């Protein structure tokens with residue numbers, strides 16, 4: 001079963017300048033805990049954004065989507081489409097699409113769950129930003145309480161499931 005997991009600002013930004021334009025350790029820990037032991041599917045640009053001690057993401061089957069047939073991605077499985085990523089030779093009980101914006105758009109129609117972190121950070125979008133997908137009426141969700149990070153940002157977790 002396919003789920004998406006992402007963190008966004010309220011304005012809908014998920015990425016900027018090849019990374020994520022805020023710091024939120026509670027959300028990184030949330031991501032690690034939900035995905036550990038499972039398959040994580042990502043676009044090539046998100047693979048390229050992973051810091052060194054996280055490339056590959058440890059304890060998870062990393063699957064990278066690219067059109068570059070000869071791509072070198074040590075510690076990851078390279079595939080040529082999202083549909084390939086979602087058709088493993090070796091099934092996983094849980095597969096998480098972990099970004100980026102390009103892959104979320106392709107995966108959202110194939111998914112039954114989205115785990116969304118909302119970050120109250122003032123981030124008016126900039127021209128090159130990666131932006132969150134939008135959930136339409138086929139999705140319904142529940143929201144956690146607004147929390148404050150030890151780092152100071154307000155945030156909260158939403159869980160959406162396909163109707």
Ligand SMILES: NC(=O)c1ccc[n+]([C@@H]2O[C@H](COP(=O)([O-])OP(=O)(O)OC[C@H]3O[C@@H](n4cnc5c(N)ncnc54)[C@H](OP(=O)(O)O)[C@@H]3O)[C@@H](O)[C@H]2O)c1
Nearest residue numbers: 006007015016019043044045046066067099100101102103
């Ligand atoms: N906040 C969050 O939750 C979160 C999560 C993940 C990433 N991010 C951020 O988001 C940004 C990256 O996202 P992005 O949207 O720029 O890139 P992306 O979706 O991670 O990667 C795009 C790449 O995927 C490949 N691709 C796309 N469509 C394809 C298709 N139909 N078939 C085959 N390959 C395909 C292409 O790779 P090739 O060019 O190699 O062909 C393309 O360049 C970064 O800023 C990262 O930090 C944020």
Ligand SMILES: COc1cccc(-c2nc(N)nc(N)c2OCCCOc2ccccc2CCC(=O)O)c1
Nearest residue numbers: 005006007020022023024027028031032054098117
């Ligand atoms: C600054 O915000 C961050 C930092 C790290 C991960 C995330 C994140 N969060 C949610 N909810 N879904 C996601 N899809 C997501 O990206 C996952 C891909 C990016 O992973 C990063 C990025 C920087 C640093 C570390 C990691 C992975 C850490 C790990 O698990 O071992 C957000």
